[PDB]
mmCIF file with all atom_site columns, all heavy atoms in Angstrom:
data_model
loop_
_atom_site.group_PDB
_atom_site.id
_atom_site.type_symbol
_atom_site.label_atom_id
_atom_site.label_alt_id
_atom_site.label_comp_id
_atom_site.label_asym_id
_atom_site.label_entity_id
_atom_site.label_seq_id
_atom_site.pdbx_PDB_ins_code
_atom_site.Cartn_x
_atom_site.Cartn_y
_atom_site.Cartn_z
_atom_site.occupancy
_atom_site.B_iso_or_equiv
_atom_site.pdbx_formal_charge
_atom_site.auth_seq_id
_atom_site.auth_comp_id
_atom_site.auth_asym_id
_atom_site.auth_atom_id
_atom_site.pdbx_PDB_model_num
ATOM 1  N N   . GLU S 1 40  ? 63.326 108.395 -1.172  1.00 0.00 ? 40  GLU S N   1
ATOM 2  C CA  . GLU S 1 40  ? 63.041 107.312 -0.257  1.00 0.00 ? 40  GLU S CA  1
ATOM 3  C C   . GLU S 1 40  ? 62.259 107.831 0.929   1.00 0.00 ? 40  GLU S C   1
ATOM 4  O O   . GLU S 1 40  ? 62.806 108.765 1.601   1.00 0.00 ? 40  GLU S O   1
ATOM 5  C CB  . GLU S 1 40  ? 64.346 106.643 0.197   1.00 0.00 ? 40  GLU S CB  1
ATOM 6  C CG  . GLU S 1 40  ? 64.195 105.569 1.290   1.00 0.00 ? 40  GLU S CG  1
ATOM 7  C CD  . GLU S 1 40  ? 63.489 104.309 0.795   1.00 0.00 ? 40  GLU S CD  1
ATOM 8  O OE1 . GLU S 1 40  ? 63.885 103.836 -0.312  1.00 0.00 ? 40  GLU S OE1 1
ATOM 9  O OE2 . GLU S 1 40  ? 62.578 103.831 1.478   1.00 0.00 ? 40  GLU S OE2 1
ATOM 10 N N   . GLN S 1 63  ? 54.256 111.466 -5.405  1.00 0.00 ? 63  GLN S N   1
ATOM 11 C CA  . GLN S 1 63  ? 53.778 112.800 -5.578  1.00 0.00 ? 63  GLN S CA  1
ATOM 12 C C   . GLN S 1 63  ? 54.853 113.677 -6.202  1.00 0.00 ? 63  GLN S C   1
ATOM 13 O O   . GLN S 1 63  ? 54.603 114.818 -6.650  1.00 0.00 ? 63  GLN S O   1
ATOM 14 C CB  . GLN S 1 63  ? 53.407 113.415 -4.188  1.00 0.00 ? 63  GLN S CB  1
ATOM 15 C CG  . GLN S 1 63  ? 51.942 113.210 -3.802  1.00 0.00 ? 63  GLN S CG  1
ATOM 16 C CD  . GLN S 1 63  ? 51.166 112.203 -4.635  1.00 0.00 ? 63  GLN S CD  1
ATOM 17 O OE1 . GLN S 1 63  ? 50.201 112.522 -5.323  1.00 0.00 ? 63  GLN S OE1 1
ATOM 18 N NE2 . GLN S 1 63  ? 51.577 110.920 -4.562  1.00 0.00 ? 63  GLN S NE2 1
ATOM 19 N N   . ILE S 1 84  ? 58.371 104.755 -12.118 1.00 0.00 ? 104 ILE S N   1
ATOM 20 C CA  . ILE S 1 84  ? 59.568 104.621 -12.885 1.00 0.00 ? 104 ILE S CA  1
ATOM 21 C C   . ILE S 1 84  ? 59.286 105.029 -14.300 1.00 0.00 ? 104 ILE S C   1
ATOM 22 O O   . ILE S 1 84  ? 59.780 106.076 -14.762 1.00 0.00 ? 104 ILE S O   1
ATOM 23 C CB  . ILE S 1 84  ? 60.120 103.184 -12.884 1.00 0.00 ? 104 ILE S CB  1
ATOM 24 C CG1 . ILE S 1 84  ? 60.757 102.856 -11.517 1.00 0.00 ? 104 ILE S CG1 1
ATOM 25 C CG2 . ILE S 1 84  ? 61.157 102.997 -13.928 1.00 0.00 ? 104 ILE S CG2 1
ATOM 26 C CD1 . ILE S 1 84  ? 60.856 101.383 -11.251 1.00 0.00 ? 104 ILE S CD1 1
ATOM 27 N N   . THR S 1 206 ? 74.527 76.945  2.264   1.00 0.00 ? 226 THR S N   1
ATOM 28 C CA  . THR S 1 206 ? 73.689 77.177  3.476   1.00 0.00 ? 226 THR S CA  1
ATOM 29 C C   . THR S 1 206 ? 73.423 75.882  4.277   1.00 0.00 ? 226 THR S C   1
ATOM 30 O O   . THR S 1 206 ? 72.426 75.201  4.022   1.00 0.00 ? 226 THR S O   1
ATOM 31 C CB  . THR S 1 206 ? 72.317 77.890  3.156   1.00 0.00 ? 226 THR S CB  1
ATOM 32 O OG1 . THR S 1 206 ? 71.339 76.927  2.643   1.00 0.00 ? 226 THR S OG1 1
ATOM 33 C CG2 . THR S 1 206 ? 72.486 78.966  2.106   1.00 0.00 ? 226 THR S CG2 1
ATOM 34 N N   . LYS S 1 214 ? 59.170 75.330  16.168  1.00 0.00 ? 234 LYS S N   1
ATOM 35 C CA  . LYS S 1 214 ? 58.590 74.524  15.110  1.00 0.00 ? 234 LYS S CA  1
ATOM 36 C C   . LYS S 1 214 ? 59.557 74.516  13.890  1.00 0.00 ? 234 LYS S C   1
ATOM 37 O O   . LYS S 1 214 ? 59.217 74.029  12.814  1.00 0.00 ? 234 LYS S O   1
ATOM 38 C CB  . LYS S 1 214 ? 57.213 75.058  14.661  1.00 0.00 ? 234 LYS S CB  1
ATOM 39 C CG  . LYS S 1 214 ? 56.171 75.006  15.814  1.00 0.00 ? 234 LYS S CG  1
ATOM 40 C CD  . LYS S 1 214 ? 54.730 75.094  15.287  1.00 0.00 ? 234 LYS S CD  1
ATOM 41 C CE  . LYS S 1 214 ? 53.718 75.378  16.387  1.00 0.00 ? 234 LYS S CE  1
ATOM 42 N NZ  . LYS S 1 214 ? 52.424 74.712  16.190  1.00 0.00 ? 234 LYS S NZ  1
ATOM 43 N N   . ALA S 1 233 ? 63.837 91.347  5.442   1.00 0.00 ? 253 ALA S N   1
ATOM 44 C CA  . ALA S 1 233 ? 63.535 92.603  6.084   1.00 0.00 ? 253 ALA S CA  1
ATOM 45 C C   . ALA S 1 233 ? 62.137 92.563  6.655   1.00 0.00 ? 253 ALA S C   1
ATOM 46 O O   . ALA S 1 233 ? 61.667 93.577  7.143   1.00 0.00 ? 253 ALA S O   1
ATOM 47 C CB  . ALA S 1 233 ? 63.685 93.732  5.115   1.00 0.00 ? 253 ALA S CB  1
ATOM 48 N N   . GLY S 1 236 ? 59.737 86.728  10.456  1.00 0.00 ? 256 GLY S N   1
ATOM 49 C CA  . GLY S 1 236 ? 59.224 86.522  11.821  1.00 0.00 ? 256 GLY S CA  1
ATOM 50 C C   . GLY S 1 236 ? 59.616 85.208  12.448  1.00 0.00 ? 256 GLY S C   1
ATOM 51 O O   . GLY S 1 236 ? 59.204 84.145  11.960  1.00 0.00 ? 256 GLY S O   1
ATOM 52 N N   . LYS S 1 253 ? 72.071 85.278  16.472  1.00 0.00 ? 273 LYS S N   1
ATOM 53 C CA  . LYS S 1 253 ? 71.602 85.863  15.250  1.00 0.00 ? 273 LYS S CA  1
ATOM 54 C C   . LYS S 1 253 ? 72.794 86.737  14.698  1.00 0.00 ? 273 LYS S C   1
ATOM 55 O O   . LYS S 1 253 ? 73.710 87.061  15.416  1.00 0.00 ? 273 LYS S O   1
ATOM 56 C CB  . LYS S 1 253 ? 70.426 86.804  15.626  1.00 0.00 ? 273 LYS S CB  1
ATOM 57 C CG  . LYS S 1 253 ? 70.153 87.953  14.706  1.00 0.00 ? 273 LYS S CG  1
ATOM 58 C CD  . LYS S 1 253 ? 68.772 88.542  14.958  1.00 0.00 ? 273 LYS S CD  1
ATOM 59 C CE  . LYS S 1 253 ? 67.686 87.469  14.820  1.00 0.00 ? 273 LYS S CE  1
ATOM 60 N NZ  . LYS S 1 253 ? 66.356 88.054  14.711  1.00 0.00 ? 273 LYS S NZ  1
ATOM 61 N N   . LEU S 1 254 ? 72.752 87.077  13.395  1.00 0.00 ? 274 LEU S N   1
ATOM 62 C CA  . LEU S 1 254 ? 73.821 87.823  12.799  1.00 0.00 ? 274 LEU S CA  1
ATOM 63 C C   . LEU S 1 254 ? 73.759 89.304  13.163  1.00 0.00 ? 274 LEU S C   1
ATOM 64 O O   . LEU S 1 254 ? 72.653 89.844  13.288  1.00 0.00 ? 274 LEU S O   1
ATOM 65 C CB  . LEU S 1 254 ? 73.798 87.705  11.268  1.00 0.00 ? 274 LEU S CB  1
ATOM 66 C CG  . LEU S 1 254 ? 74.827 86.727  10.705  1.00 0.00 ? 274 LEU S CG  1
ATOM 67 C CD1 . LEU S 1 254 ? 74.811 86.757  9.173   1.00 0.00 ? 274 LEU S CD1 1
ATOM 68 C CD2 . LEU S 1 254 ? 76.202 87.080  11.185  1.00 0.00 ? 274 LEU S CD2 1
ATOM 69 N N   . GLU S 1 258 ? 77.527 92.773  10.518  1.00 0.00 ? 278 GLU S N   1
ATOM 70 C CA  . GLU S 1 258 ? 77.786 91.488  9.805   1.00 0.00 ? 278 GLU S CA  1
ATOM 71 C C   . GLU S 1 258 ? 76.818 91.419  8.638   1.00 0.00 ? 278 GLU S C   1
ATOM 72 O O   . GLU S 1 258 ? 77.238 91.057  7.510   1.00 0.00 ? 278 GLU S O   1
ATOM 73 C CB  . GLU S 1 258 ? 77.556 90.318  10.728  1.00 0.00 ? 278 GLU S CB  1
ATOM 74 C CG  . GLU S 1 258 ? 78.756 89.949  11.549  1.00 0.00 ? 278 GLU S CG  1
ATOM 75 C CD  . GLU S 1 258 ? 78.381 89.304  12.889  1.00 0.00 ? 278 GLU S CD  1
ATOM 76 O OE1 . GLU S 1 258 ? 77.192 89.025  13.081  1.00 0.00 ? 278 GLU S OE1 1
ATOM 77 O OE2 . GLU S 1 258 ? 79.307 89.034  13.668  1.00 0.00 ? 278 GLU S OE2 1
ATOM 78 N N   . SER S 1 274 ? 69.395 101.766 14.789  1.00 0.00 ? 294 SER S N   1
ATOM 79 C CA  . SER S 1 274 ? 68.258 100.967 15.177  1.00 0.00 ? 294 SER S CA  1
ATOM 80 C C   . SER S 1 274 ? 68.467 99.588  14.630  1.00 0.00 ? 294 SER S C   1
ATOM 81 O O   . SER S 1 274 ? 68.012 99.255  13.526  1.00 0.00 ? 294 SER S O   1
ATOM 82 C CB  . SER S 1 274 ? 66.975 101.586 14.645  1.00 0.00 ? 294 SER S CB  1
ATOM 83 O OG  . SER S 1 274 ? 65.842 101.060 15.295  1.00 0.00 ? 294 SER S OG  1
ATOM 84 N N   . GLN S 1 281 ? 66.630 97.079  6.871   1.00 0.00 ? 301 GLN S N   1
ATOM 85 C CA  . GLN S 1 281 ? 67.230 97.821  5.745   1.00 0.00 ? 301 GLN S CA  1
ATOM 86 C C   . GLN S 1 281 ? 68.007 96.824  4.951   1.00 0.00 ? 301 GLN S C   1
ATOM 87 O O   . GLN S 1 281 ? 67.766 96.691  3.747   1.00 0.00 ? 301 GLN S O   1
ATOM 88 C CB  . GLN S 1 281 ? 68.163 98.915  6.319   1.00 0.00 ? 301 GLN S CB  1
ATOM 89 C CG  . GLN S 1 281 ? 67.376 100.093 6.825   1.00 0.00 ? 301 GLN S CG  1
ATOM 90 C CD  . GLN S 1 281 ? 68.232 101.120 7.549   1.00 0.00 ? 301 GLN S CD  1
ATOM 91 O OE1 . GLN S 1 281 ? 69.418 100.838 7.872   1.00 0.00 ? 301 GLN S OE1 1
ATOM 92 N NE2 . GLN S 1 281 ? 67.638 102.271 7.790   1.00 0.00 ? 301 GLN S NE2 1
#
Side-chain angles (χ1 to χ4, degrees):
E40 174 69 46
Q63 268 15 243
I104 285 162
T226 81
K234 298 201 192 214
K273 155 165 305 193
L274 258 184
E278 273 153 6
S294 198
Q301 284 172 348

